[PDB]
Amino acid sequence: NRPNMVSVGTIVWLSSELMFFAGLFAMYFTARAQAGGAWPPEPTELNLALAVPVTLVLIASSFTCQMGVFAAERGDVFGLRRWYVITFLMGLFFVLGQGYEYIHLVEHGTTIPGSAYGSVFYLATGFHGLHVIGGLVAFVLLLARTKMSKFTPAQATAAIVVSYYWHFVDIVWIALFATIYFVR
Amino acid sequence: VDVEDVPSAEWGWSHMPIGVMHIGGLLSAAFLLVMMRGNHVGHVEDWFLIGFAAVIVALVGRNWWLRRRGWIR
Amino acid sequence: DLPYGSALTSSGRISAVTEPGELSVHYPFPTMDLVVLDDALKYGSRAAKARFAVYIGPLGADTAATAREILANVPTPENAVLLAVSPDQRAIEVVYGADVKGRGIESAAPLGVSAAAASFKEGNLIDGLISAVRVMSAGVSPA
Amino acid sequence: MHIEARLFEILTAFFALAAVVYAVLTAMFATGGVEWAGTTALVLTTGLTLITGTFFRFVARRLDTRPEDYEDAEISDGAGELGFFAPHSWWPILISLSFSTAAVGAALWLPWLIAAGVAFVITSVCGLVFEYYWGPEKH
Amino acid sequence: STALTHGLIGGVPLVLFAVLALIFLTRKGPHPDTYKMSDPWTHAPILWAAEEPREVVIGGGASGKW
Amino acid sequence: ELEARRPFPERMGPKGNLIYKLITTTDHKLIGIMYCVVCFAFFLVGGLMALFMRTELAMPGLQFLSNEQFNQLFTMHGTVMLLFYATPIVFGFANLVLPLQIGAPDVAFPRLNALSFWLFLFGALIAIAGFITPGGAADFGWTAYSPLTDAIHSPGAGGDLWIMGLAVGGLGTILGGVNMITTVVCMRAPGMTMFRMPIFTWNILVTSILVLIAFPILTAALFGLAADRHLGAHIYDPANGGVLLWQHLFWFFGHPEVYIIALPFFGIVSEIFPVFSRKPIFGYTTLIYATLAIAALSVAVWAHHMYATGAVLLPFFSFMTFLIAVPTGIKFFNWIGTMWKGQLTFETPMLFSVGFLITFLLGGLSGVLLASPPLDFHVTDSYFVIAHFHYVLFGTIVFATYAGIYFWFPKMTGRLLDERLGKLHFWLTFIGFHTTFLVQHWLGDEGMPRRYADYLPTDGFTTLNVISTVGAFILGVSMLPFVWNVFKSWRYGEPVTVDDPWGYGNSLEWATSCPPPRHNFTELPRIRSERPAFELHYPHMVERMRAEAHV
Amino acid sequence: ETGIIKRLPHGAYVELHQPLGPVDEHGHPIPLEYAGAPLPKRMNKLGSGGAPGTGS
Ligand code: HEA
Ligand code: HEA
Ligand SMILES: CCCCCCCCCCCCCC(=O)O[C@H](COC(=O)CCCCCCCCCCC)COP(=O)(O)O
Ligand SMILES: CCCCCCCCCCCCC
Ligand SMILES: CCCCCCCCCCCCC
Ligand SMILES: [Ca+2]
Ligand SMILES: [Cu+2]
Ligand SMILES: [Mg+2]
């Protein structure tokens, strides 16, 4: 009969977090306008054979995260744990996939000090990867709390607000993925 | 000390004489003042010693005066 | 019957106001003198485990029977020692509960009367109360 | 809670208008074309009010009038338990100390101090989250 | 000059502080005037009691007059 | 009807009454008090920095300061005043009365509220800790213009500590803003609708929205600067367009940030004027629209700080900057209308509020002068600019801050500050401020640029600099009476046994004891307007206020 | 202190407390005497959180 206080606090903070990514987006666009015709410039060669499967995994993690919310709203703690463990594994795969992309980009001459494109690319995607890592920590902390006490409505609220952050992270990546790999 | 000030007054050592803290503070400031005797050629440190010694002396004097007038016990 | 700006709340508490720049207490004594008396009352009661009280006002015609009624307003009146002073009556009524009986108040109560009377002759009301409380509290044991 | 999001929708419309106007006005008769830094900030400033306003719009249409949303509600209408509010906690000062340790390490570029700070933050955040959920000791 | 500059910087704030303090701190505060024995007790009756110790048959009393 | 009372209220709590509370409290009342003491310590610390500069600028030639030390001084002086004093004390007043104003027992997130204080205290200490490094603290100005902040031009660790200290404190501000939005939306008492809240509550809620827009982008910009200095990135490289990239982001943060420390103090005087005028706030409904318009407009006028760069669209920002003056002018007419045909008594909270009106206007009039690019082409980066933000900040974060302190001190402490000492403090502050800041309009117009450590005897700036130096030291000695009043009146001040020491309070905090209990309320009255306490204390005036509300 | 805030019908805000011993007829607990042992301060440490559920 009353709005969820934790949900309102999380959504309010999630809106503010978007302005942090606004600054990173401004840096990428400012450097893109000064590229001069090459964006990305040589020797940076983005490959979609790896980014696309990595992006699809993160998108699929949102669906399983939503499934855990349905279990949490249903009062099924075991269903919530199964879906959030699966979500954590795919979220971890996203971090490993991004890092594996980072290793090959560095070997081919795309680094933060190497070029202006490397600076904006790594800051924008790296800070998002830090947000993904923070989301994985939230999953572990929330799941550890599931083994401490009985499944209460306040505990179910904590599961919902964590999924809000995960959905926010996934949506931001879609903007980053479309802006970097398609709007060149 | 009374149980109103220290609730666990009867469970352990809870009182230190005020004379020990007052004399210790005065000796505290005196040791800071004698440390200006040395081989250092700068005086930035000396002013820091003077300020800390003055603060300690002022605190000791304020506490002693307030206890003498009876405003604090 | 409530004063101006005062209201009775739904919980029974009285929500009062005072005009800006005015005082809500306004006792006709210096602030520092009040602090000394409060310290004498607080620490004197602590040292004797008996609540000491001071009353300043009228005491009817037979002061002794007014003090007796007045002591019923002191919290825990059975373990309380009240000193009543009537400037217009120029008298000193001292009353104590049954719990204080036999703890040395009988020797100290006249001394508190004498201490208060000596300072009252000099035109010192707060000083007389402070002196009376100090001597009476020092003569009462926590037993 | 119909007023709360009406505040954000009103801000959303103005931010959307300013973002569109600034982008168009910088595209034409402005050196360098579209000024990307301000345009990006204005566009995502609209996003901030849009997400909060949309959420408040969905919450408002679900639940009926609250006692604080009534134009003539009684104090007794709000009787009942409000919720859980933490009485005391020394974890928040530990979280800030943990975060300040990492910031100092990042300021002076000490990777060991950064690693210690990150580990301290995780432990401090874990204590805050688990503070009111730890069970009794089992022996 | 240089002596006048240091005189104004150190002198005017102290002179202004003294003048303004004499204007305001010499005024009468809202505190009531101390009661005098020669004057009648026109104040409301006052009952003061200590809060200690933390929480009606009389045991006796005494008389007195000054 | 004899009720036993102590001869005097307890001066201080027993041994151990505070130290464990300070590190474990979740009470907004104690936390709000903790924000005032620390913010007032930082204000004293930063004021000493200005005294050093102002003494140095009294005479031509470097008497005791170097160029580097002077450059570090105005950077840190400005950082402490803007981010370590003004921004936190906004939440200082929020934790004091906002839960009381909406009839709430606590903030939405008590532990997150405590986290903001410590994040803010340790973040401020990190930035100030640059002064203990051999190189010194940051010396590129609080604006931190690029590429002056690059590792090539600012290699010292003082700048790095400045960047990281701001990031930690900015996180606390964001969390505090999140707490205040949630508290207003969810913790309102029954019958307290959105359009019945006090103006101060409205201002804080709207300000917290501005925090969520300005501070995250500042954190993003600072992290990009940290990447350049430590990872060798090219975010703010001039060849990459980073000169204007830093300015755009920093001013998109900065100008919404100065209304974060303007609107709440607009709300403070909006609470004080009706109380001492014995009349309801004039245009209560319109003041909310004015605040909302000011908040909305402040987000798209950032580039008027970049007129002289020759790289911004002048007509767009010049026009919208002119638009801000309209809602701000509306607030003056409501404040004057509130005082109009009232019964003014001019106590210390009211006296400081009147000083706000006089001081804020002159700084505001200089604002429209600066808003025009042609006039700003001569006075930008000069002491005329210094005169604008000093008249217009001083009124809000000092005059209204002191007005709120005097207004709410009996509420949060149960003791009244001395009025005679308060009047001396107000007049000393007013005279010193005007003496030290009136002549700076002439200095900037004459040709004296800002951020100069030294000038020449033939420049013609000596006489006005001496006058400004005399006034600044009056502001320094104006500090002693207020500190003495707070120190003495906190234990020996006049006791407050009533709910409303000012008689005609309107908001809900005046319907509770002084100080309020742990959960702020032992009862609540019927809420039917924006003056519930006035209705509770004066039931007979309820009919009159409804009948006479419209002119 | 259980951390649960309750609003009374007349508007009072009170926090629910868990007594560690006998209570009065009014409901307020009888004050207990310190015995040199640690005292609980969190309801979850007293078993109020229960158990999640037996299983993997
Ligand atoms: C926001 C609030 C704010 C406040 C309150 C002030 C307060 C004062 N400031 Fe301002 N200032 C700024 C905000 C503020 N400032 C900003 C944003 C800048 C930008 C700088 C930049 O370009 O980066 C600035 C820069 C600035 C300049 C420009 C200097 C230059 O560019 O060269 C000057 C010029 O004199 C100035 C002077 C003063 C003076 C005399 C006070 C008076 O308030 C000071 C008097 C106050 C005191 C508190 C005196 C202290 C007295 C004591 C007794 C202390 C004792 C304490 C101990 C012993 C511990 N400051
Ligand atoms: C409290 C903080 C605060 C507030 C409230 C303001 C309010 C305003 N400011 Fe600003 N400003 C600063 C803090 C503030 N400012 C700071 C800190 C800087 C410099 C930062 C730095 O460089 O470090 C700055 C610098 C700054 C500049 C850039 C100067 C430069 O560097 O060249 C400009 C230019 O447009 C500007 C204009 C305005 C205007 C038009 C208002 C308006 O909001 C004011 C409008 C108010 C009135 C007009 C009075 C009321 C109106 C009426 C009674 C009706 C009258 C109508 C007319 C005259 C048309 N100020
Ligand atoms: C990092 C491990 C990842 C494992 C992959 C699967 C993800 C889900 C893990 C669930 C763990 C459940 C543990 C549990 O319930 O124990 C609970 C207690 O756990 C803790 O207190 C600590 C948990 C671990 C903290 C993690 C900190 C660092 C996070 C790093 C993130 C990368 C059970 O407590 P109990 O005694 O039963 O009350
Ligand atoms: C309280 C008002 C103070 C006004 C100070 C300004 C004085 C200006 C004098 C200029 C003299 C030039 C030679
Ligand atoms: C809004 C602009 C205000 C200008 C104030 C000027 C102060 C007078 C200075 C006189 C200097 C004479 C040399
Ligand atoms: Ca000089
Ligand atoms: Cu501006
Ligand atoms: Mg400039």
Contact flag for E and A (3+ C-beta pairs < 8 Å): no
List chains touching F (3+ CB pairs under 8 A).
Answer: A, B, C, D, E, G
Q: Which of A29, A119, A161, A172 to mutate to test the interface with F (most CBs of F within 10 A)?
A: A119
């299983």: which residue's tokens? G55
**Encoding tokens for residue F425?**
């403090």
Structural domain containing residue B5: 1-73
CA distances for G38 relative to A171, G34, G35, G41, angstroms:
49, 9, 9, 9
Helix or strand or coil: residue D84?
A: strand
User: Where are the domains positioned within chain D?
Assistant: 1-139
| C86: helix, strand or coil | strand
Tell me how many degrees the CA angle C91-C97-C103 measures, rounded to the nearest 5: 100
Is the minimum CB–CB distance between A120 and chain F shorter than 8 Å?
A: yes
Question: What's the CA-to-centroid distance between F249 and ligand 2, angstroms?
Answer: 19
With a CB cutoff of 8 Å and minimum separation 6, the contacts of B4 are: C46, E52, F14
State the burial class of residue G32 (Cβ atoms within 10 Å of its Cβ: 0-12, 13-18, 19+): exposed
Select from C69, C96, C121 the residue whose CB has the most chain E CBs within 10 Å, as the one to mutate to test that interface. C96
Q: Give the list of residues 6+ apart from residue F331 with CB closer than 8 angstroms, or none.
A: F266, F287, F290
Q: Which pair of structure tokens corresponds to residue A9? A: 């606090």
Rounded Cα–Cα distance for residues C48 and C96 (Å):
13
User: Tokens 């149980």, residue?
Assistant: B3
Shortest-distance Cα residue to atom 53 of ligand 2: F329
CB contact under 8 A, E34 and C76: no
F313 interfaces chain D, CB cutoff of 8 Å: yes
Number of CB atoms found within 10 A of residue F326's CB: 12
Chain A contacts in chain G segment 16-55 (CB below 8 A): 44, 49-53, 55
CA of D102 to the centre of ligand 1 (A): 31
How many CB atoms sit inside 10 A of residue F148's CB?
Answer: 16
Answer yes or no: are the C-beta atoms of F396 and F359 closer than 8 Å: no
Scan for tokens 């002759």, then name that residue.
C121
User: Looking at the DSSP assignment, which residues form a beta bridge with residue C92?
Assistant: C85
Does any CB of chain E come closer than 8 Å to the CB of residue C77?
yes
Contacts 24+ apart (CB under 8 A), G50-54: G50/A149, G50/A150, G51/A149, G51/A150, G51/D135, G52/A77, G52/A146, G52/A147, G52/A148, G52/A149, G52/A150, G52/A151, G53/A77, G53/A78, G53/A150, G53/A151
Helix (H/G/I), strand (E/B), else coil: F385: helix
Number of Cβ atoms within 10 Å of the Cβ of D6? 15
C-alpha F544/C-alpha F175 separation (Å) is 43
Distance CA A94, CA A132 (A): 8
For chain E, give the residues followed by a break (C–N over 2.5 Å).
55
Residue set of the binding site of F for Fe(II)-heme a:
54, 77, 142, 259, 380, 383, 388, 390, 440, 450-451
With residue E49 as reference, give the H or E element that holds it: strand E46-49
- Residue among F501, F505, F523 minimizing CB distance to C9: F523
* DSSP, res F500: B
Q: What is the DSSP string of F101-163?
A: HTT-SS-S-HHHHHHHHHHHHHHHHHHHGGGGSSS-S--STTTT-TTTTSTTT--SHHHHHHH
Place of tokens 């360098």: D32
> Does A95 contact ligand 3 (Cβ within 6 A)?
no
CB of F251 closer than 8 Å to CB of F243: no
List, as ranges, residues 22-81 from A with C-beta within 8 Å of D.
22-23, 25-26, 29-30, 32-33
F151 Cβ under 8 Å from any chain D Cβ: no
- Rounded CA separation G25/G39 (Å): 24
Written as six digits, the tokens of A107 are 């070997």
Residue F168 buriedness (CB in 10 A; 0-12 / 13-18 / 19+): buried
Q: Are A181 and A46 in contact (CB under 8 A)?
A: yes
Instruction: Name, in order, each residue with C-beta under 8 angstroms of G29's C-beta and a sequence gap of 6 or more.
Output: G17, G19, G20, G21, G22, G23
Helices D91-107, D111-130: inter-axial angle, 10-degree rounding:
160
Across the strands, what pairs with C82?
A: C53, C95
- Is the Cβ–Cβ distance between E60 and C101 less than 8 Å? yes
| Pair D37, F244: CB distance under 8 Å | yes
- CB count, 10 Å around CB of F251? 21
Number of structural domains found in chain E: 1
Length of chain B in residues, anyone?
A: 73
Joined together, the tokens standing for residue F192 give 């307290």
The minimum-distance atom of ligand 1 relative to the CA of F142 is: 23
Q: Is the peptide bond before F147 cis (omega within 30 degrees of 0)?
A: yes
Q: Which two tokens stand for residue F38?
A: 């620390």
Query: How many domains in chain B?
Result: 1
Q: Is F110 exposed, middle or buried (0-12, 13-18, 19+ CB in 10 A)?
A: buried
User: Which whole-number Å values give the CA distances from C49 to C76, C78, E51, E53, in the listed order?
Assistant: 12, 12, 11, 6
Return the half-sphere exposure (C-beta side, CA atoms, 13 A cut-off) of residue F26: 22
Question: Among F365, F373, F369, which residue's Cα sits nearest to residue F318?
Answer: F373
Quick one: DSSP state of residue C91? E
Instruction: Nearest by CB to G50, from A78, A146, A150: name it.
Output: A150
Q: How far is CA D122 from CA A18, D93, E37, F20, F113, in A?
A: 23, 14, 71, 24, 19
| First-last CA distance in chain E | 71
What are residue A87's DSSP bridge partners? none
- The three state secondary structure string of F227-287 is HHHHHCCCCCCHHHCHHHHHHHHHHHHHHHHHHHCCHHHHHHHHHHHHHHHCCCCCCHHHH
Question: In angstroms, rounded to a whole number, what is the distance separating the alpha carbons of residues B48 and B43?
Answer: 9
Q: How far is the CA of F376 from the centre of ligand 8 (A)?
A: 10
Separation of alpha carbons G18 and G46, rounded Å? 10
Determine phi and psi for F193, rounding to 5 degrees.
Answer: -75, 175
* Triad F152, F157, F158: Cα angle to 5°: 105
Burial of G34 (0-12, 13-18, 19+ CB in 10 A): exposed
Enclosing H/E stretch for A126 = helix A116-146
Chain discontinuities in chain G, listed by preceding residue (C to N exceeding 2.5 Å): none
Counting ligands in written order, the one closest to the CA of D135 is 3
Q: Which residues make beta-bridge pairs with C86?
A: C91
**Which residues are CB-neighbours of F515 under 8 A, at least 6 positions away?**
F29, F411, F412, F413, F414
Residue G38 preceded by cis peptide, ω within 30? no
Cα-based distances in Å from G20 to G6, G15, G23: 20, 16, 9
Which residue range forms the structural domain that includes residue F527? 18-548
Instruction: Tell me the two tokens of residue F507.
Output: 């908001």
Terminal Cα distance for chain A, rounded: 48
Question: How many Å apart are CA C106 and CA C129, to the nearest integer?
Answer: 18
Strand, coil or helix: what is C90?
coil
The whole-angstrom separation of Cα A54 and Cα F67 is 54
Measured from the CB, is residue F463 less than 6 Å from ligand 4?
yes
Determine the distance in angstroms separating the CA of F467 from the nearest CA of chain E, rounded to an integer.
8
CB nearest F523 (choices: G5, G10, G15): G10
User: Are the C-beta atoms of residues F111 and D91 closer than 8 Å to each other?
Assistant: yes
**Which residues 108-137 in chain C show a CB within 8 A of chain E?**
109-110, 113-114, 116-117, 120-121, 123, 125
Residue F398, both tokens: 């000092």
Beta-carbon contacts of residue F375 (< 8 Å; ≥ 6 apart): F369
Which of these, A44, A29, A42, A24, lies nearest to A129 by C-alpha position?
A24
Identify the residue among C46, C51, C133, C134 best suited for mutation to test binding to B, counting B beta carbons within 10 A and taking the highest: C46
User: By C-alpha distance, which of F164, F141, F20 is closest to F76?
Assistant: F141
Ligand 3 centroid, distance to A89 Cα (angstroms): 14
Q: For chain F, how many structural domains are there in total? A: 1
Q: Exposed, middle or buried: residue D134 (CB in 10 Å: 0-12, 13-18, 19+)?
A: middle
Q: Does residue F372's CB lie within 6 angstroms of at least one atom of ligand 2?
A: no
- Please answer yes or no on whether C90 and E66 come within 8 Å at the CB atom: yes
Measured by CA distance, the residue closest to atom 43 of ligand 1 is: F47
What does the DSSP 8-state code read for residue F82? I
β-pair partners for D88: F25
Q: Which ligand number lies closest to the CA of residue F255? A: 7
Mutation pick for ligand 1 pocket among F40, F45, F74, F437 (CB with most ligand atoms within 8 Å): F74
* CA F238, chain centre distance (Å): 34
In this structure, the strands spanning G13-15 and C80-86 are unpaired
Positive or negative torsion for Cα F275, F276, F281, F287: negative
Instruction: Quote the CA–CA distance of E61 and C97 in Å, as a whole number.
Output: 9
Q: Which residues pair with F494 in a beta bridge?
A: F416
Both tokens of F404, joined, read 């709120």
Cβ-count burial C55-76 (b if 16+ within 10 Å, e if not): bbbebeeebbebbbebbebbee
C67, C34, C47, C76: which is closest to C135 by C-alpha?
A: C47
Please work out whether the CB of residue F438 comes within 6 Å of at least one atom of ligand 4: yes
Interrupted after residues, chain A (C–N over 2.5 Å): none
Cα separation of the two ends of chain F: 46
Contact F99, F183 (CB under 8 A): yes
**Which residues of F fall within a CB distance of 8 Å from E51?**
6
Scanning chain D, the segments in alpha helix (DSSP H) are 2-27, 36-62, 91-107, 111-130
Return the axis-axis angle of helices F263-277 and F87-101, rounded to nearest 10°: 50
Sheet with C80-86: list strands edge to edge. Answer: E46-49, C51-56, C80-86, C91-97, E58-62
Q: Measured between alpha carbons, how far is A158 from A84 in angstroms, rounded to an integer? A: 13
Strands C91-97 and E58-62: antiparallel
User: Ligand 5 centre and the CA of F440: distance in Å?
Assistant: 7
Helix, strand, coil % (nearest 5) of chain A?
80, 0, 20
From F464, F468, F470, F475, the mutation candidate for ligand 4 (largest count of ligand atoms within 8 A of CB) is F464
* Domain definitions of chain A by residue range: 5-181
F457 lines ligand 2 (CB under 6 A): no
Bridge pairing between strands G4-7 and E58-62: unpaired
Question: Nearest Cα to E57, choosing from C94, C78, F160, F17?
Answer: C78
Q: Strands C80-86 and F415-416: what pairing?
A: unpaired
Fold of A5-181: Four Helix Bundle (Hemerythrin (Met), subunit A) (1.20.120)
- Would residue F529 count as lying in a domain? yes
Helices (H) and strands (E) in chain G, counts: 0, 2
- Dmax (CA) for chain B in angstroms is 53
3 state SS of A18 = helix
Q: What residues have CB less than 8 Å from E41, skipping those under 6 apart? A: C56, C57, C86, C87, C88, E35
Which residue has tokens 């013609």?
Answer: F460
Breaks (C-N over 2.5 A) in chain B follow: none
C104 φ, ψ (degrees, to nearest 5): 100, 5
Contact A91, A61 (CB under 8 A): yes
CA F345/CA F326 separation, integer angstroms: 30
Give how far the C-alpha of residue F549 lies from the chain's centroid of Cα atoms, to the nearest Å: 32
User: Are G44 and D134 in contact, with CB atoms under 8 Å apart?
Assistant: yes
Q: Which sequence spans correspond to the domains of chain C?
A: 1-143
Task: Report the C-alpha gap between F271 and F407 in whole angstroms.
Answer: 9
The secondary structure of chain C in percent helix, strand, coil, rounded to multiples of 5, reads 45, 15, 40
Number of alpha carbons in the 13 Å side-chain half-sphere of residue A184: 11
Is F290:F206 a contact under the CB 8 Å cutoff?
A: no
For G15, name the nearest residue in chain F, comparing CA atoms only: F519
